[PDB]
Design an enzyme around this catalytic site. Structure first.
Site, mmCIF file in Angstrom:
data_model
loop_
_atom_site.group_PDB
_atom_site.id
_atom_site.type_symbol
_atom_site.label_atom_id
_atom_site.label_comp_id
_atom_site.label_asym_id
_atom_site.label_seq_id
_atom_site.Cartn_x
_atom_site.Cartn_y
_atom_site.Cartn_z
ATOM 1 N N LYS A 135 37.511 34.622 110.380
ATOM 2 C CA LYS A 135 37.292 34.063 111.723
ATOM 3 C C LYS A 135 38.105 32.986 112.221
ATOM 4 N N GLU B 242 31.935 20.149 112.206
ATOM 5 C CA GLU B 242 32.810 20.804 111.190
ATOM 6 C C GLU B 242 33.505 19.756 110.048
ATOM 7 N N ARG B 243 34.237 20.500 109.093
ATOM 8 C CA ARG B 243 34.564 19.959 107.999
ATOM 9 C C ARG B 243 35.810 19.293 108.114
#
Lengths: 100, 187, 50, 501, 469, 470, 101
Positions: free
Chosen positions: F158, F184-185
């Site tokens: 993705k 997010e990371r």
């Protein structure tokens, strides 16, 4: 012991001082608190269920729940200009739309 | 003016009543009169102890209120109005609650403080007096918060004493040493 | 072996019971008044130090 | 005497309090204390109850301050005073926690030797940023062919071990420790893991059987077991991952490398669950808190590989999630899947079937590219990923009892041979250098030329064979970690010569 | 201390006291409420402020009036332990149920206790043999280990345990404890009668078994601390005598369900399903007080009623963490007429990893699991279609697995009357031989009824001749 | 701003209650700032509870927060700096870098809460865009005023797809782009930053062809929720006042949904169906509406979405599914077979995909393509059990074609030099529409099934056959 | 409730109050909370099947889902000889009729 959470502090200093409502708070109501898009107003006792109320923030609402110490209006406008301590005039005409 | 809220249990009535009494001009008087009427409502011999908990209507209570102010017309006009609030909402067991909480508000405005100095036995009178001297002398009490040193005898403290007042405590109790002493000598 | 390691634990509980026996002696006497006082004078020293 | 020294130490201690605000307990019990007073409190402080208990504080109200007690609760009561400690919670961190079982407060529960603290750290230490990071590129080794080739795990990342209750969960962890023991001893310092294992919700007994297993294999010199067993308090259990982690961060900072296995993140949600419903805070999806996700998120992101202008080390995370039936569409397994960049699904059936600990070769992804494993092992397993994916599809068509294309059945026979090779018994390491032959050979139809039964014996003989005759080929694969035209040709040539003995 | 009180409320079985003096008991103390019904015993669990405790009530709650004396024992009630507690049945307090008069004791110790630490844990993998073929194959039992079974409702769960009592309690321990938590009146009476018949109790003497019994009838609070009483008798044997013990429970499920009952009222807002949040910790303590120290050694066998045939529910699920072996029993597999009802693809052990109890043995058990699972995968296929619509090789495999299924049925030698087949005992050494043969196809010709209800391989062989008749 | 004092009373996690003074109270969506050595803790005012008491939700660290510590009112909603130096740098929720390029210089300032443009402004006009990727181009071509929705698994390839999208289209366009990361990371953040510094989309000159706005997951939920809003307001500033088309990107918006679920429960609200938030709807409607094609600029939002556990009948993905105009599903199976990108043809659809608006031939071929594959998929049961040797010659030929087209969806990407390891391809929208007709008309069934795999245009596919033959 | 029915001993007069509690289960569920709770307190089953009932026999008991453990020495010897292992024999029939059809 026997108490409501519509014994709010701006109201309560007024009842003690012999300051009675005088049809400003029976007719007309004024916001105690506004949270979660659920303005809680003290007043509005001559309102029909779902009757239209006009704020002093230009926000319109209807009154789905009627309850004795607070009447739980649901906002049609956004929450941004509705804050506690606000005059809430009673438009006094339940929700109607032009037909023709 | 509010002095900042105190309490969670019926202290909103107390905050409001306090501010209503600064505009009255006297808080000391207000408090004093309530104290003598509250005390004769509790110390009623029939249905002041076999009836303090609500059991009677808003309307039946209003005729009892008319009899209460007949026992003391002195209560001013705002603290007489505070009774209507209690009758209407039909609260009664928290009648003494609001008055004590008010008391806390009054006695802060007065610049008084209450200190409890729990002990295992009634202490020397000199022991109090030296403690009082020490706290005035020190930065703990600057004046404006003049203490009452109240000795209590409790079975909660065996040996020593523990000083309490304000937000400062000094503990030179023995009990703590005994607990720890026990723990470490079973290894 | 198991009895010895247990006997060392019994010796441990014996002086533990000795702590209680001394508490009843100390709180019986006017040693209960005379060492409390000794704390009280220290209590002045500490509170003046604040 | 033992008593005298102890009495003398107790004796020289003086109490005398002095604090910002005292308070008197008012409700307590259900593991969770609530005190009256304490209006000047800072969030997360430790407040010492006079019973001998200490408790941190997570709720502060102008009414009742909510201090979650550690340990005992049966000597805490109402009438007592509590005194603020004046310290926010902190744990000793250092090279004195090596070979010691330690709880969540960092005191040894085993007594194998005293804690040497080269610093103290905080249980909550903020996760690394965008700027410190450096890209991941360093291999991590279980000695299992499937883990390494299909779902490769790097250092400075997080990849998720998901599966059923106690189905080889211990085995996964040990496999990783064992093959990385060789490297610990070795010459590169930047190849040595000082592994840290976290055990939340398990009994004392499992841990005590594990330590024994770790001491026989002489990997307990560098291993740390941070533990919060069933018996020990619900707060210490939530607290256990966050304090195991500061000790991992310290390796990463120093230029040393470690890997922190977090067992179970599910049991941390259960602990936090206890706290939240007894401070009457509304839960989220499925009765687990409405801010649980934040708890796992801040933690997992503390495995990081940094730049050489900071640490030359890397913390690696291995989360562990145990299902309460199997379900992965549950809020706590959902939350964790989001955070990691891999899935290492452990199937129930495949565990019995011979792959132990079992890795499912169906659903399982590794988002990372394949430079996160040694370069040789990628090439040999180049088409390994397709072969497994085709074997499943073909196989499914194959199961009805219908007969089909002979071409289909070549893929069906080939896959079977790869799976049998993949099977390996739990608790056996096997270096990468000697995984390189076996997968090339399988892909290159050298292991399909021989019968299904004799595959384990052939593998064992083949490797024994290479140490004696072609030991050059292996030395290169160990030293440089790749293969070229000369080495590949040799490997292909060497296999054919000894293809069935 | 003697702290008198009066009863402020009586809400359910979670009564509340208001202690009139400033002296105030700690959490986990015991209190006696005086009434013309005799004693009622309560346990302090919360302090709610201004000297008002809230008590779990561990004895019935009827006939109680608000404003009635309370008395403080000064600590948790004391059950009775010793050598003179052997051959006795003891309540939640230490009261006779066997009614051989008051119980002589040396040391009487309190029901609650703190769990022995991780440094005091010293856990062995030394084995124990039973004499059951199925046990030996799938997941051995051990000395020092804690073994678990997840039995049916009450149609085959007891019979299994009774067979276990006869083998393990007469080949190990000097002591044995049976604690039966919220069991039925019929079960307790059968077990006492049986013990004295099989000479395991000598009333005139000192016995090798002691007993703790507490009806399923009794209110929620009382059932929990039946479990506590029994745990104390085991703690005296593990510690103070320092000898190996045993512990048997049939069932420990009553504990979890009791805890979930008291939980809702107390203040603890229940977790989903209806079960308590405090489950992991409450259970936890108990399972670290049942453990093997460097003193005695408590080998335990614990039997758990599965609720509505879901082992996913919070109570069976959290039990599996505290087990180093399990042998999960499906209710279904009992109904089928297959006894023992242990599922073979759902058994597991940490006492057989991959070579732990002999390499030869592990390899034989491994193959049996692979075969059996193949057949389950083809169950769908066999049913939907035929079985003659498959290959001859898959059919062999299926037929072999079908033999292994039927072989696993082994009659019991305690409940032998009931089953209708006279019992069998199969050693560990025999077990290995019998399966060795079966995998190698040395007995893939004889009938598939010859296998049902027989122990060892040799008996299948003989049985073929009886069937042939 | 002006001296306004409220004093804290209760810290209950994210929730912090303050006691403002009479006649200078807050409003709902204002920003309160509390001095701390952890930056400025901003508290988003979210309720009024009366008695002069506001109840707020936290965004920034609340650790060692001392109660009674005085609380200022800024006077309005979180106010960032916005401009054309937003470009080329990383910014968190408060408008302040986490990449440390110092104080971002302001042209204009705005709050990040804003209204969406009413019906009188709203129009639907759009210009067809080319991604350089064949699958998208035939079967779901992009358009201006995008409400596009990139539904897929986690780590199914993705990340790789979004990366390529930025690389081709963002730099080529005269318009700018705004890349925003919601909860997010930090691993992903450093790799995305680094990878694109080489490819030049983040120029080292101040002005660039993309922006970065990273609010990340180890930070409190309140901040994550209104990280999405920050990104979106930067795009609106471009859209009006500098009067130009852009292409917004948000990744994953499922983080916006998850962040909103956590702070509904904490304000006191009881769960909705499948545990989500009640105000999922009204929240979506305000986010989606701001992204449209006005009578000035245009915003083409391409939003990555994560479907938890591959279940997309859950009301949070599924309601959202309408509200996203060009749904695409990037499923896990297709990824496993080796087939990259992970796009599923049937479940890839757009607002404009039929008529002469996207050209007659594109629709016509695209219909012929979906049908060819759908027949082969119905026949998979049949080839497995029944056999495909008592089915017709025509059926076999349709299957061979379906297989030829299936292996012609594969191609490598330029961001895939360690995700594939073979440099990208650009196959423009007409080229693909032309190549796929060829396969269907029967012109190239002398090309093997495997000689479509991993190549570009038809010119390339014919040539890869030459190579395979030797 | 159930434990208030019991066979008292010789001493209390040889008491009995025999309980046969009658349960309304829809779907013939043994994987639902209320049936398994009942079964756990009790011993045996006196299962009754819809299918058998329609097909002759009123009341029709289902032998393959009936078990008794509390009656297996209740019966006297006359009613034992005649009924020699018939319980077993129709559990020899049960195997036979699985694969007969």
């Amino acid at each position: 012991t026997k108490a409501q959470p519509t014994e709010v502090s701006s109201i309560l200093e007024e009842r003690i001082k012999g300051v009675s409502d005088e049809a400003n708070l029976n007719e007309t109501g004024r916001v105690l608190a506004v949270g979660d898009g659920i303005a809680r107003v003290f007043g509005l006792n001559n309102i029909q269920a779902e009757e239209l109320v006009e704020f002093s923030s230009g926000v319109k609402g209807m009154a789905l729940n009627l309850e004795p110490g607070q009447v739980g209006i649901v906002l049609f406008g956004s929450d941004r200009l509705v804050k506690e301590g606000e005059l809430v005039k009673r438009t006094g005409n339940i929700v109607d739309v032009p037909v023709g | 003016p509010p002095p900042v809220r105190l309490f969670g249990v019926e202290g909103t009535y107390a905050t409001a009543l306090y501010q209503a009494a600064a505009k009255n001009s006297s808080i000391d008087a207000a408090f004093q009169s309530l104290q003598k009427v509250e005390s004769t409502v509790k110390k009623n011999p029939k249905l002041g102890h076999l009836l303090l908990n609500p059991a009677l209507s808003l309307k039946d209570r209003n005729s009892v209120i008319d009899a209460i102010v007949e026992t003391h017309k002195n209560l001013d006009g705002y603290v007489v109005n505070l009774l209507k609030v209690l009758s209407e909402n039909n609260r009664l067991g928290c009648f003494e609650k609001i008055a004590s909480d008010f008391g806390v508000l009054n006695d802060a405005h007065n610049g008084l403080l209450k200190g409890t100095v729990t002990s295992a036995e009634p202490l020397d009178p000199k022991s109090f007096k030296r403690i009082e001297k020490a706290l005035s002398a020190s930065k703990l009490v600057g004046q404006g918060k003049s203490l009452k040193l109240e000795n209590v005898v409790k079975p909660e403290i065996k040996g020593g004493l523990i000083v309490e007042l304000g937000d400062k405590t000094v503990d030179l109790s023995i009990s703590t040493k005994i607990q720890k002493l026990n723990k470490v000598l079973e290894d | 072996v198991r009895y010895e390691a247990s006997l060392r634990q019994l010796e441990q509980r014996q002086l533990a019971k000795s702590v209680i026996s001394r508490v009843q002696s100390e709180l019986g006497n006017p040693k209960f008044q005379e060492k409390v006082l000794q704390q009280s004078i220290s209590e002045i020293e500490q509170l003046l130090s604040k | 005497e033992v008593s005298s020294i102890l009495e003398e130490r107790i004796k020289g201690v003086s109490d005398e309090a002095n604090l910002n605000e005292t308070g008197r307990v008012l409700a307590v019990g259900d593991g969770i204390a609530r005190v009256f007073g304490l209006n000047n409190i800072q969030a997360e402080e430790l407040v010492e109850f006079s019973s001998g208990v200490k408790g941190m504080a997570l709720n502060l109200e102008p009414g009742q301050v909510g201090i979650v007690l550690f340990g005992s609760d049966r000597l805490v009561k109402e009438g007592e005073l509590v005194k603020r400690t004046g310290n926010i919670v902190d744990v000793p961190v250092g090279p004195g926690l090596l070979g010691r079982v330690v709880d969540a407060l960092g005191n040894p529960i085993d007594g194998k030797g005293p804690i040497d603290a080269a610093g103290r750290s905080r249980a909550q230490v903020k996760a690394p940023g965008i700027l410190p990071r450096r890209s991941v590129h360093e291999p991590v080794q279980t000695g299992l062919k499937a883990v390494d080739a299909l779902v490769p795990i790097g250092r400075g990342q997080r990849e998720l071990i998901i599966g059923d209750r106690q189905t080889g969960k211990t085995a996964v962890a040990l496999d990783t420790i064992l093959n990385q023991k060789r490297w610990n001893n070795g010459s590169d310092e930047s190849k040595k893991l000082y592994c840290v294992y976290v055990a939340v919700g398990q009994k004392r007994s499992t841990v005590a059987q594990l330590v024994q297993t770790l001491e026989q294999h002489d990997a307990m010199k560098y291993s740390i077991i941070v533990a919060a067993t069933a018996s020990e308090a619900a707060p210490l259990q939530y607290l256990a991952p966050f304090t195991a982690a500061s000790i991992g961060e310290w390796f990463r900072d120093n230029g040393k490398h470690a890997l922190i296995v977090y067992d179970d993140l599910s049991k941390q949600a259960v602990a936090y669950r206890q706290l939240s419903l007894l401070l009457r805070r509304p839960p989220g999806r499925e009765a687990y808190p409405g801010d649980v996700f934040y708890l796992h998120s801040r933690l997992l992101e503390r495995a990081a590989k940094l730049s050489e202008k900071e640490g030359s080390g890397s913390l690696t995370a291995l989360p562990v999630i145990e299902t309460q039936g199997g379900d992965v569409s549950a809020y706590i397994p959902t939350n964790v899947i989001s955070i990691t960049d891999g899935q290492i699904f452990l199937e129930a059936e495949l565990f019995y079937k011979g792959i132990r600990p079992a890795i499912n070769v169906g659903l399982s992804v590794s988002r990372v590219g394949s430079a996160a494993q040694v370069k040789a092992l990628k090439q040999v397993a180049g088409s390994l990923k397709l072969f497994l994916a085709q074997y499943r599809e073909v196989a499914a068509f194959a199961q009805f009892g219908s007969d089909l294309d002979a071409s289909t059945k070549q893929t069906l026979v080939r896959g079977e041979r790869l799976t049998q090779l993949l099977k390996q018994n739990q608790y056996s390491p096997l270096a990468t250098e000697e995984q390189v032959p076996l997968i090339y050979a399988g892909v290159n139809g050298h292991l399909d030329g021989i019968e299904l039964s004799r595959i384990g014996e052939f593998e064992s003989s083949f490797l024994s064979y290479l140490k004696s005759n072609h030991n050059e080929l292996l030395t290169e694969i160990r030293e440089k970690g790749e293969l070229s035209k000369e080495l590949l040709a040799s490997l292909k040539s060497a296999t054919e010569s000894f293809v069935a003995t | 201390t003697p702290i008198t009180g009066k009863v402020t409320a009586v809400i359910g079985a979670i009564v509340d006291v208001h202690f009139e003096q400033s002296e105030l008991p700690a959490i986990l103390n015991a209190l006696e409420i005086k009434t013309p019904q005799g004693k009622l015993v309560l346990e302090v669990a919360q302090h709610l402020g201004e000297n008002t405790v809230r008590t779990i009530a561990m004895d019935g709650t009827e006939g109680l009036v608000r404003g009635e004396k309370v008395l403080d024992t000064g600590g948790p009630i004391s059950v009775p332990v010793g050598r003179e507690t052997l051959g006795r049945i003891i309540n939640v307090i230490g009261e006779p149920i066997d009614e051989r008069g008051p119980i002589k004791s040396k040391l009487r110790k309190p029901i609650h206790a703190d769990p022995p630490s991780f440094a005091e844990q010293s856990t062995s993998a030394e084995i124990l043999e039973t004499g059951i073929k199925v046990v030996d194959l799938l997941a051995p039992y051990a000395r020092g280990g804690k073994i678990g079974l997840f039995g049916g409702a009450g149609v085959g769960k007891t019979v299994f345990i009774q067979e276990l009592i006869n083998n393990i309690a007469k080949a190990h321990g000097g002591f044995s404890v049976f604690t039966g938590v919220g069991e039925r009146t019929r079960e307790g009476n059968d077990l006492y009668r049986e013990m004295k018949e099989t000479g395991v109790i000598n009333l005139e003497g000192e016995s090798k078994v002691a007993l703790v019994f507490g009806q399923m009838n009794e209110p929620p609070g009382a059932r929990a601390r039946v479990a506590l009483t029994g745990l104390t008798i085991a703690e005296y044997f593990r510690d103070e005598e320092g000898q190996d013990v045993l512990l048997f429970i049939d069932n420990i499920f009553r504990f979890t369900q009791a805890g979930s009952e008291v939980s809702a009222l107390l203040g603890r807002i229940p977790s989903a399903v209806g079960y308590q949040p405090t489950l992991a910790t409450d259970m936890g303590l108990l399972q670290e007080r049942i453990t093997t120290t460097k003193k005695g050694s408590v080998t335990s066998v614990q039997a758990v009623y599965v609720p509505a045939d879901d082992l996913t529910d919070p109570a069976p699920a959290t039990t599996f963490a505290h087990l180093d072996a399990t042998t999960v029993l499906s209710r279904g597999i009992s109904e089928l007429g297959i006894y023992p009802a242990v599922d073979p693809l759902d058994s597991k052990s940490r006492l057989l990893d991959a070579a732990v109890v002999g390499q030869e043995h592990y390899d034989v058990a491994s193959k049996v699991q692979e075969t059996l699972q193949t057949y389950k995968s083809l169950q769908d296929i066999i049913a939907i279609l035929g079985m003659d619509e498959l290959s001859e090789q898959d059919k062999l495999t299926v037929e072999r697995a079908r033999k292994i299924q039927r072989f696993l049925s082994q009659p019991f030698a305690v409940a032998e009357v009931f089953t209708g087949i006279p019992g069998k005992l199969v050693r560990l050494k025999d077990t290995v031989a019998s399966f060795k043969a079966v995998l190698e196809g040395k007995y893939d010709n004889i009938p598939e009824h010859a296998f049902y209800m027989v122990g060892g391989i040799e008996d299948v062989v003989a049985k073929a001749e009886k069937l042939a008749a």
